[PDB]
Every structure is written in C-alpha cells, then in structure tokens.
C-alpha cells in the first residue's frame, strides 16, 4: 500500500498536494494473492 500497488484512482474527482482517508475497493496490505504464470507448450527441436 505504501508503494500504492493495486490502488484505483477515483475517475470522478482528483486531489492535489493533500492527504485524506478515502473509502474504495482496494487489495489487502501484504496480500500475496493468487499467482498464475503462462508457460510455453511442448515442442521437439524445430517442430512444435
């Protein structure tokens, strides 16, 4: 959260040079979450 990871800016309004507490949908601090990694399919030499 300190790095502002996963933060969604409200599209309706902006704030400049101020600090406030805002209620919004946000990810939990220190949440590893679910990790999905894409991988290459099986291939033999030149022929996939």
């Amino acid at each position: 959260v300190s790095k502002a990871d996963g933060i969604i800016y409200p599209q309706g309004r902006t704030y400049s040079n101020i600090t406030i507490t805002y209620q919004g949908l946000f990810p939990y601090q220190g949440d590893h979450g679910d990790m999905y990694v894409y991988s290459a399919g099986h291939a033999t030499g030149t022929t996939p």
């Binding site: 959260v1 800016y9 400049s16 600090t19 946000f26 979450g33 990694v37 894409y38 290459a40 399919g41």
Partner: protein, 48 residues
C-alpha cells in the same frame, strides 16, 4: 457475475526460442478505508 475462471495460454515456442513469461498476480477487491497521499501532480505515490 459471481464466478470467473482464468483462461490458460500456451505458446508453441521452439526449445531454443522458449521464453519465460511474466507471472500475473490476482488480488481480490474489498471496500477498505485507505490513507492517501497526493502530490502536486495529484497521483498517489504513498498510502496506508
């Protein structure tokens, strides 16, 4: 929509041309009060 399923991605890369793919991390969203710091630009760089 109450349910979502990730769709698998497969690449027929050659063994020599096999490339690692960046992992994607999915974090669930829940309503959360967030302390927000706004710069002169107004983008959020720091939060709690």
């Amino acid at each position: 929509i109450k349910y979502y399923s990730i769709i698998p991605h497969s690449i027929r890369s050659i063994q020599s041309d096999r490339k690692a793919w960046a992992a994607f991390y999915v974090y669930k969203l829940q309503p959360l009060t967030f302390l927000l710091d706004f710069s002169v630009d107004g983008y959020i760089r720091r939060a709690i």
